Design a protein around this ligand. Structure first.
Ligand SMILES: C=C(/N=C/c1c(COP(=O)(O)O)cnc(C)c1O)C(=O)O
Ligand SMILES: C=C(/N=C/c1c(COP(=O)(O)O)cnc(C)c1O)C(=O)O
Ligand SMILES: [K+]
Ligand SMILES: [K+]
Ligand SMILES: [K+]
Ligand SMILES: [K+]
Lengths: 455, 455, 455, 455
């Protein structure tokens, strides 16, 4: 049902809560954007599951054995063998984190004017694609855009949308297919192995490349083991290895499922693409032998990726998130369903019926959650969607959500109860939340440092 | 109520999560003696709360700042300032752990033939008193010997037993009074501030010294803040500082309430005794500037002692233990009452009422608990009692218990559920627990290496 | 003179100490390319001073205090306060290392078609300038191109070349001035404070921006304190703070003079540019609150930058390098003069005068140095120069050198003797060093993976 | 000749020097005893090689994997296997440090009235022997008491003194023979394998037990490999294993040759003695499964003992000490010869010809060395010798020395030059040193906290 933690606590960090009066001044001080708050003032930090994970004693043992050589580091070799053994890719290039690998892939695989199609988008991934002259096309199934629809494997690619794209645009005009596991903006929804098989077969018949966004691939592997028929007897590692046999390469953010606080890499099977990747990584990240990472960080990521394959760890990871969602749903709190592997998304539209999407209710619901509970959450709605490049209007996604993101191995069920009990109490008087308007907007990726004012 | 952890997890200790079938194999290889189990085969290790605590990031930062000098280490000075500030004693001598300090105090404060009186005893404390020629006298209140009696401050000293000892034996024939906080053998029961005040008044009138066994003094301070009238507005540190104002010195095991894995010390107000303590500590521990400890450990203990004063930490510590006792008591499982500050004691005499004491029900119940849950607990009954030296018969204690001892900041409430749910399921078919017989019994310390088999 | 290390060893990194016969086997397996040697087979690794520094106990204590929050980390604030205090710049943006900051500065400060002028160049710095449409102009003084000329402050900018550029091209057509301290390509040569003052006066009169490449600025500050008249009473920090008072911003690689293994940052006084820098850093590095770094690394870099200001540390750092150069020069071994702050450069064109440049004497001399001593050094000659893109011929640099680059606080004078004694013995039978030919040459980054064999 | 360090520096700790005016106040403040000084005020701390060693990255990796279980710790098993494999003893009991093991051995192996004979004595070892009723008899050869006599293997036991002891006193009246390797008070002088064979043969013929003081056994093994004929081809580990085949047990201080900052153990082959050792260690140290050590400390000691067997490490260790002695001897500074494995001993009698042994010149020479150089050294003369138990007069050893003790892997040759250059300058005006007299004397082991005043 809900298993206990498959580990012990080795070391702790103390937390505290500042009074609601100070919390209100802090939200004022931060311009009503949860990204501009101070960490010391936060009790439970659910802003992101990225780089906020607790490492194990074995990883920390690896941190003491950092081989910091510019080339030929033992840590690089360990990370290389581990990725080749668990993912199965021929070549491996470390990067400082995920978007570093995306910068390389977009410059290597995109010709200006070509199309890139994926199962929904991500903010940094789509930026690098559009910066290199590509046009993004969403080919996820339509059900992934409906927050309340509770169906399995929402992240799957609509094979008919992919087929119509190939026919209308031509295979030569498609740079590659970008398959993300899991799909972050849909709520952390998994992709089925059958879908990855079908995508591989269809793209291979037209010579189209397929690259994975493997950021949360282990959470995706758990959903396959739990809910896809024919995989209940497969280990997590066997499932992960088979997932990547249907791809030509991948970008990875170790900061998620590799259980580290920094790190990423780029994988590929093609030798010419690997030759050009080594030329480019030196410009932006560093030598191909460390890729903008200290040796101790390559070591921690190599160990963390192997620890992520333990079934009990990933089962507890996902079911802890599920416990938070089941407790909120049992009280009537509207959430995205089904709950994903890394976070619970509060539906701000149903939570703030009085607010409109132009009044930015998700950004305002996140502010209220910290004031009332001392929990930091992230806005995942129209503000994160950005503006259309040609028209200049808001991108309006159906999903206007507030993301409660769970770092791996950091919090307990008692912490989830604190989050749930506080949100449930806020739900009783959800009418008191005010709408917001821009006072400072960045030109790109505005949600990071955008300052708002109440309407 | 039951508060959430007032901290988050910084790092974890991984375990293997082996199933019941393999757990039985390890238990058989261990001879059905939980003391012979390998740490690597145990999920939740409740053998002892001594030296098994999880340290904070701050303490680990201090571990990197170890001044390993033989004399004049900065870590010693940090530890000295902290103990002088928090405990209020004039002089401070570090020791490698608690029994090191007890060896020193017994040799310094006892003349052969004198008496030492205390609120029950501990094995090592009483040994060093008896090894130095003292005769032990128990002066605890009579209610402390009633396992089922649920009253506050069971550890208080009976002021009339102490007065009767002074009159019959004479003050000059009393080495000192040994007041322990908390009282280990009564189940971790606290002592009231009123009792410590009265003991100080009575002994000072006869010139008798009073030394504390401060091992779990912070847990004792919480019970005073929680249950003694007039201390609800005092901080934990104010209560600790006042407790030691009624003593002339103390022996302390940092391994318990200082939140460390090694370390202890000896405190004193008398200059002559401190002069003699520095001459003796070099014999058994080391210099008065490190006392059988690395500098980094004096630093961790100094930081941990200050962290233990936080009200939210000690409240959660005690209430986590209480949560385990309350859940067992709510199912009808017989336990020692009231639940102490560090452990829950299962009444195995009552749990296995179909077994006689010569069939070792505490030892057999502990083996069953590990096979069913992966939890290691400690037998505290006829096996630990040992054999009489001259007669060769079993020492037969009134308490036949299984001690579930909780390390500080290591486990969560979900782990407490694993312990409780497995024990409750065992209780529901307790008639199937079989008795044990010796197949190997060593001459001494039989609880450590004895091997058994079912009857 | 030559001072002792102003520190003691806290912890060591073990090596294997393999004999010459095995060293030759590894060198053959590495194709006689020191870049292919495994770190675990190298005794003294002088490949680079970048990211190979030994940290202090204090920094490692800060590594235990990593606040890994996505935004508002306490480590970032510590790093921000430190850089603002020591460098004096208004705004600070962290990056994963130096070239990350250079990518940002080039995209923010360069309009396509403008010119960028500097005192020589670095590979990554010039790439990002040229990738963003700038044309590079070298304005260093002519003496910097004379390897044997032993004069102080070889890195100074020729004020008349800068003036001739402003007159011929126009101020509005100049993106900025890139002043590097120290100058890597001249051998690690310092820039005088008088030169920085004069450059600031000239550019400010035309409204031209000046940005520093502050990578080895602390070594530059020592030469100013040592050799520039009027600064002998100034502290290192006062000289550093004054140096940056003549710049509008800087790119910094913490991997060199901040005594860390990863990290860098970008500084600025202009608010609009800082506003645009926060919008761009999210694209390539991460939030402005961590910038592609774990919190623990921002903390180590903040502590290391403060430690670098200690006069005794930087004096020993520079004089250890000087000791190696003086011992080689005292035996007649040809080196670049004057010795720089971070490395000694062997003139391989002169060392192997019986070899032509097409026989790769720098690459062959470096292989011989490893076989005889277990020291890895870097080829900085025709192999590293690469091939011309259109013609396919070797780029033929005037400097054919072997760089002995010294990591900070890693080696002792006895290690410098191992390097010197082996090189001196090679010089005495330098007529036996054989030339090398390609047996594998990759299309790009040939210095990284090329393989050779003797002629 | 003098090899470079067979390791790199992984992390450093900063040091500093306070002015001679403050250094004089500090010596005044400490009562002219170097043990009462503060570590922060010391530049190069040569007080002792005990527990002041720098650990390796591998040991620090082991510190992150401390298994802190009360019983069955993986760290205890690793230490147990390592000691059994390298020393060859059947049973192993950990202790917090060396004198903890001595306390156990003296209580287990000594009957009141028996004799204990050894190659000179040590302060804590002789105390525990005399405390348990034994009378100490020195059976080292007479040449070991002559500081200037330069002969190999000064620590050997005089076989004729041992034979006369057996004849005069009887074999039944000798508890055991205590053979120390190396011999600390003779200057760190080694014992030959031939001597250990002869001692074993002679004692076995009379049934007398032999126990080793293995504190610096690895330094002893190096001298056997270097200077004893027939061992030049043996590895260090083979020599150590053969050394202990001639003993029935050993007491060990890991704080010396196990390259740790805390830790020790007791080894023995007899099962009955091991049974009684487990009963006693619980009283003074802790359970036999950790023996007063944290798990991480057992792990570090298990790794450090294996690293000590590397030939290059121990060769550099000994030759670094030798470099200090050769430099002092080349200037005419009188020292103990030959130099031992862990320290250089300055002969205070030849250094202070004007002072007498009753004026305590060694304690006064140590004070002057810190005032002039900032180096802390230890008095090793009549003050450390103690007083005779029956007469009450000073024990007057021929050796009145000041010990410059070298921690392992902490300092460099440049640090040894600082020590040597400062002592050589002090040697020019050695007449300015004043004599000292007691103002506070402890009852036992007086040198630790004795305060003196000038005469
Ligand atoms: C930081 C987040 N996401 C990172 C991310 C990234 C970028 O990874 P880095 O943060 O490691 O660049 C790429 N792809 C996906 C699907 C991601 O979710 C977040 O969701 O908080
Ligand atoms: C502390 C020192 N000696 C310790 C020592 C000891 C005692 O070890 P502990 O310091 O670990 O108790 C035993 N035997 C010998 C030969 C020793 O040298 C010292 O010489 O500074
Ligand atoms: K422990
Ligand atoms: K120490
Ligand atoms: K590095
Ligand atoms: K992080």
């Amino acid at each position: 049902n809900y298993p206990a933690e498959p580990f012990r606590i080795k070391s702790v960090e103390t937390v505290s809560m500042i009074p609601r009066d100070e919390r209100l001044k802090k939200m004022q001080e931060a311009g009503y954007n949860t990204f501009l708050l101070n960490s010391k003032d936060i009790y439970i930090d659910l802003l992101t599951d990225s780089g906020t994970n607790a490492m194990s004693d074995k990883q920390w043992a690896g941190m003491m054995m950092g081989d910091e050589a510019y080339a030929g580091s033992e840590n690089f070799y360990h990370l290389e063998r581990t990725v080749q053994e668990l993912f199965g890719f021929k070549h491996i290039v470390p990067t400082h984190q995920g978007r570093g690998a995306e910068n390389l892939l977009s410059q290597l695989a995109i010709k200006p004017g070509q199309y890139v199609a994926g199962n929904m988008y991500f903010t940094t991934t789509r930026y690098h694609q559009e910066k290199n002259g590509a046009v993004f096309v969403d080919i996820v199934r339509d059900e992934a855009h409906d927050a309340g629809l509770n169906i399995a494997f929402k992240g799957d690619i609509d094979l008919k949308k992919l087929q119509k794209l190939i026919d209308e645009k031509g295979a030569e005009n498609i740079a590659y297919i970008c398959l993300a596991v899991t799909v972050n903006l849909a709520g952390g929804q998994p992709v089925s192995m059958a879908n990855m098989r079908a995508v591989r077969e269809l793209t291979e018949a037209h010579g189209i490349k397929v690259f994975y966004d493997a950021t949360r691939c282990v959470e995706n592997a758990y959903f396959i083991k739990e809910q896809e028929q024919g995989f209940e007897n497969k280990s997590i590692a066997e499932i992960v290895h088979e997932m990547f046999s249907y791809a030509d390469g991948c970008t990875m953010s170790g900061k998620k499922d590799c259980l580290v606080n920094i790190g990423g890499f780029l994988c590929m099977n093609d030798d010419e693409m690997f030759s050009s990747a080594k030329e480019l990584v030196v410009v932006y990240e560093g030598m191909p032998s460390y890729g903008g990472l200290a040796g101790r960080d390559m070591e921690a990521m190599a160990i963390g990726l192997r620890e992520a394959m333990q079934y009990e760890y990933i089962e507890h990871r996902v079911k802890q998130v599920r416990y938070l969602g089941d407790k909120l749903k049992a009280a009537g709190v509207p959430i995205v369903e089904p709950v994903g592997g890394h976070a619970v998304f509060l539906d701000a539209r149903r939570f703030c019926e009085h607010l409109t999407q132009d009044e930015f209710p998700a950004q305002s619901l996140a502010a209220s959650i910290y004031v009332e509970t001392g929990v930091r959450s992230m806005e995942r709605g129209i503000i994160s969607a950005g503006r259309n490049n040609v028209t200049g209007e808001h991108h309006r996604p159906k999903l206007e959500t507030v993301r409660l993101t769970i770092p791996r191995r950091v919090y307990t069920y008692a912490h989830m109860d604190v989050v749930a009990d506080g949100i449930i109490k806020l739900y009783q008087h959800k009418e008191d939340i005010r709408g917001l308007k821009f006072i400072y907007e960045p030109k790109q990726l505005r949600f990071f440092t955008a300052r708002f004012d109440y309407i």
